[model samples]
Target: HVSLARGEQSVKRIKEFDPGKDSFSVLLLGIDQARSDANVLVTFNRKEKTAKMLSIPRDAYVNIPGHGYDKFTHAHAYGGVDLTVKTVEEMLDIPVDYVVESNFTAFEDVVNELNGVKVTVKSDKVIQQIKKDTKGKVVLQKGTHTLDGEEALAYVRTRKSDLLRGQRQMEVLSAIIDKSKSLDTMGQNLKMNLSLKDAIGLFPFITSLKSVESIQLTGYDYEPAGVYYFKLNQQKLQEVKKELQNDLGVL
Candidate 1:
């Protein structure tokens, strides 16, 4: 069993990538708690230099390798990273070469390293509509807003109060990418440099891993009814599994 507090596991695994090979894949797992299960899988193809990020809802029912049918997220709690990876491999029929699991703390650090993110608010009504439609209060005004790391964390983790959890997460991710790629001549260059340094510190965690070829999974964009939850279609799940199997040439 894996230790939740220490994050020490008994799994002996290694991952490597070859540029000359056919392709490679990497799984990005975002978890709510530290040293927990990975619910998101971002598959990257090094050969094609393309990425497909698939967010697996925690509530999706699946059969764990050694465990009975249960919520997909529980695989991590049961057997740690190994089980989580194995569960995903069986479900998607794709080999997961490397895995990166991050919690709220890591999320905040990543945003801070990007020197905050810039997002365009589609409408002024978004703020008011979000507040009235969900339990969360609107802290940001409508329009273009630059958010610090803490605010960015809040933006993604406000599922309890906001109805658009998945969309908000994607927005935050896009903002992060935009901010990282943005270059300013006389503005916060020093701070940006430090943030870049902080980001560099995370390279060891990311680079020293293996790569896989393809990935196939399913996610949903849903409107909140009571709390943050989405309905999963069995047909879609089977289709995703079939596609992954086909991509990997696995039966």
Candidate 2:
């Protein structure tokens, strides 16, 4: 028997929609208690059988509800998942239909369980950094490389430009969707039922997904006041909003 798992009700941008037919937005909040690591939002369109990913950089600046302008990463540090989700909704101006918070350790296990994931190498500079960072224990020249559990985690979590970091994360993500044969239930006890149900719908949609367009908020690095933040480009963000809304079938 499956029981409905309750989520945070105080979220402002909650939407009532079914994942089986209508489109829905998901906020995958990766938190390890120290700070929220990844703020990845994806939209799955049922009719079209497709998934769209939007990687919000940690340093992206925005009004953080109660907190003022600061890194997106600090939202969780200040208030936890609820505030982080609210911050995301405010940034994208979209409904975050579902939320999943997991630790970085869990991510490694899943990659290992899936027999590792593949990531495409498109830049020599980044590739060199990857090689240098790992002390050549895991090295890649160019082309698609199958990374083990540890390698995949290292790729996603590293020092790089916000855009490049987002790209690396998205590539690892695409690899999982390409590699995993079926979707498994995320957790035990409470979230198992609804989480499993929501994940299953994306199997066929993402299984054959070959090319993933890594979307990044168009913004130049800027520091307003004394703090540093990535100031977003309004016109470019408007373009992004329209494309995502189209994917969500909202506009």
Candidate 3:
């Protein structure tokens, strides 16, 4: 029931995807107040039984096709998942075979449904902020603990810096994967192009991942017209590109 912006023509995929056997990439778009505040790209390699996740900064300066240069977050605001996927593919030169868009409410439900996820809080300032933001619904001190739905939502949403925020998000996602006995077909509060069949086909591969690697994109801050944008390190980006391409079996 879902379709992409480019119709049947994939941005990078060469054939019909069989999730059971094919190595594919997915874009996880975390929508905060309708804007893509979090963007993580994950590639699953069936043969290797491994996965790699890369978090793209929300304020990244990138070309959004017809929209000229703008922050990566605006891709969702401008055109939702379709345009956002196109923007990501253009930026990384990798095929985004699947897209998942979820908001704060849905995220909380998933974490709670999974009976909470594990995360380690390191910063006192961030911990204090989380306690305050959740209106004392959740509390944490320096150390590791399992976070409920609301706690996990607040944990990932609060940003000391987008860099650390991305890392935290990735951490929580790995916890969720670790806890998922079987993936939920969350049709509510979550939006994804993966059909039920697709989800089932990928379950074994997902659950059997021997390792989940977290990859980061390094960048410097740029302020043009007093607007903040994170300009990615070009050479570093090239290196990441090769790694992703290899994971997707393109190299």
Candidate structures ordered by TM-score, highest first? 3, 2, 1
Give the lDDT of residue 140 in candidate 3: 78
Lowest lDDT block of 10, candidate 1:
185-194
The global C-alpha lDDT for each of the candidates, from Candidate 1 onward, is 0.53, 0.69, 0.82
Model 3: lowest-lDDT 10 consecutive positions: 181-190
The Cα error of candidate 3 at residue 110, in Å, is 0.9
Sequence-dependent TM-score of model 3:
0.92
The local distance difference test score of model 3 is 0.82
Q: How would you encode candidate 1's per-residue C-alpha lDDT over 1-251 as one tens digit per residue?
A: 11223122212222332322333334555666133433555544333444455666665656788998666677878886667777877776676655545566777777767777887666555555455544564356666788776666666655442124555665676466556655322212122112344345433333332432223234453445443334457687788766554433344
Model 2 regions more than 4 Å off: 1-16, 182-193, 205-212
Highest TM-score among the candidates is held by which one? 3
RMSD of 3: 2.0
Model 3, 1-251: lDDT tens per residue? 46775765455766665544778887888877268777889998878989999999989999998899999888888888888888988999988888888777888888878888877778889878887787887787778788898788888887653578888888898888787865444647667777766666677778888989988899899997888999999999999999998988773
> How large is the C-alpha RMSD of every model relative to the true structure?
8.4, 3.8, 2.0
- Number of colliding residue pairs in each model: 4, 0, 0
For residue 102, model 2's alpha carbon misses the true position, in angstroms, by: 1.8
